[PDB]
Amino acid sequence: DDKDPMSAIKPDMRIKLRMEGNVNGHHFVIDGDGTGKPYEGKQTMDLEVKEGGPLPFAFDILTTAFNRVFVKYPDNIQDYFKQSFPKGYSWERSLTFEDGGICNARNDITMEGDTFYNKVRFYGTNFPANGPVMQKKTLKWEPSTEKMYVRDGVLTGDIEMALLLEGNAHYRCDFRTTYKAKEKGVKLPGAHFVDHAIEILSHDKDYNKVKLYEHAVAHSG
Numbered sequence: 001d002d003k004d005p006m007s008a009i010k011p012d013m014r015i016k017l018r019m020e021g022n023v024n025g026h027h028f029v030i031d032g033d034g035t036g037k038p039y040e041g042k043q044t045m046d047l048e049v050k051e052g053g054p055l056p057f058a059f060d061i062l063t064t065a066f067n068r069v070f071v072k073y074p075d076n077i078q079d080y081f082k083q084s085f086p087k088g089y090s091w092e093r094s095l096t097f098e099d100g101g102i103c104n105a106r107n108d109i110t111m112e113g114d115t116f117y118n119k120v121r122f123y124g125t126n127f128p129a130n131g132p133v134m135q136k137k138t139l140k141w142e143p144s145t146e147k148m149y150v151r152d153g154v155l156t157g158d159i160e161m162a163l164l165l166e167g168n169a170h171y172r173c174d175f176r177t178t179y180k181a182k183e184k185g186v187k188l189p190g191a192h193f194v195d196h197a198i199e200i201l202s203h204d205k206d207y208n209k210v211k212l213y214e215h216a217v218a219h220s221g
Contacts, residue, residue: 008085009038009069014115015045017066021122023103024134028052032066032118034212038082041072041216044201047209054206057127058138060163063198063212065093065105065122068157068179071194071216078189079218080155084181085111093177101127132165139164143197146175148218150188155179157194194218 017032029052034045045066049055068091073079081089088110095103103124110117127133142164146157159175194216201211 009082017118019120023057023124036070043070044213049208053208058133059207060138073218077192080189087182089181091179096174098172137166146194149191
């Protein structure tokens with residue numbers, strides 16, 4: 001093989017993002033500017049709420065919506081996400097929470113030069129007014145393992161997630177994400193797993209500004 005394996009995906013990439021949406025009827029716009037190391041599975045982003053702040057719900061519900069290109073893939077697992085560039089890919093995610101809260105999120109990911117661009121939409125509804133999301137009682141997402149597999153011909157990731165809450169409690173959420181390369185013919189990978197750890201490194205009091213970090217690694221179990 002004569003190709004530059006990093007012809008599109010460079011070892012250090014910049015990230016630009018805009019998210020729009022609403023949760024329980026509260027509309028917002030959030031911008032992101034970040035950097036990442038695709039082959040180390042690491043990324044960091046500075047997020048700024050531009051409209052709708054201070055958000056009247058837990059910022060944590062949004063954080064996994066801010067790119068599976070940032071996963072340390074070993075040589076023995078097909079890397080669908082890095083193989084999707086330069087053209088890019090998109091994902092669509094359902095987040096079903098234990099109390100009936102439901103979110104739908106999507107991201108269209110393109111690449112221009114050294115920068116991934118993210119067009120993100122996030123819609124949440126059916127959160128109980130007295131629940132931990134609307135009451136802002138969340139502390140973090142726990143580290144998780146995403147099961148990657150082909151479901152009806154489409155690469156799919158399933159995760160059993162949980163938010164730690166104030167007061168020694170957890171609040172569970174099921175994720176299902178579908179991932180679609182923009183170019184026809186990108187080979188689907190074999191089933192595998194991706195371990196994730198997402199964390200807010202810092203934030204201002206009202207979460208108008210948030211610094212976010214994620215580390216992810218693919219493995220076969």
